[PDB]
């Protein structure tokens, strides 16, 4: 399994604990982009996994230097690939405005 610290962060993200997540990432910034193949579970995956995305939580991850270049689910989809699969222009636009890469 992943570290207790990463599991603690991911739980706080899933639970919508904005202030706790902010504090964890202030104190332990290197957690922000840690992902676990083959599920690709990660702080970001906990946000993007949801049919209705919590953009406050996504903004918090962005403030703490989350990136959008690694896969975010067990399909090995990047954030942009997920947006494409879901035909979600809201997510597409957010990702583009945050320099997310687009695969070929």
């Amino acid at each position: 399994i992943a570290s207790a610290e990463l599991r603690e962060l991911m739980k706080a993200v899933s639970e919508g604990h904005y202030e706790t997540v902010n504090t964890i990432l202030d104190k332990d910034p290197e957690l922000v982009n840690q992902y676990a193949p083959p599920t690709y579970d990660s702080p970001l995956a906990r946000v993007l996994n949801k049919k209705h995305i919590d953009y406050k939580m996504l903004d918090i991850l962005v403030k703490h230097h989350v990136d959008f270049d690694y896969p975010i689910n067990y399909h090995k989809e990047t954030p942009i690939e997920l947006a494409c699969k879901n035909q979600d222009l809201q997510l597409f636009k957010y990702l583009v405005q945050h320099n997310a890469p687009i695969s070929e």
């Binding site: 990463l6 840690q34 992902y35 676990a36 193949p37």
Partner: peptide, 5 residues
Amino acid sequence: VDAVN
């Protein structure tokens, strides 16, 4: 990046 597991 890939987490230490």
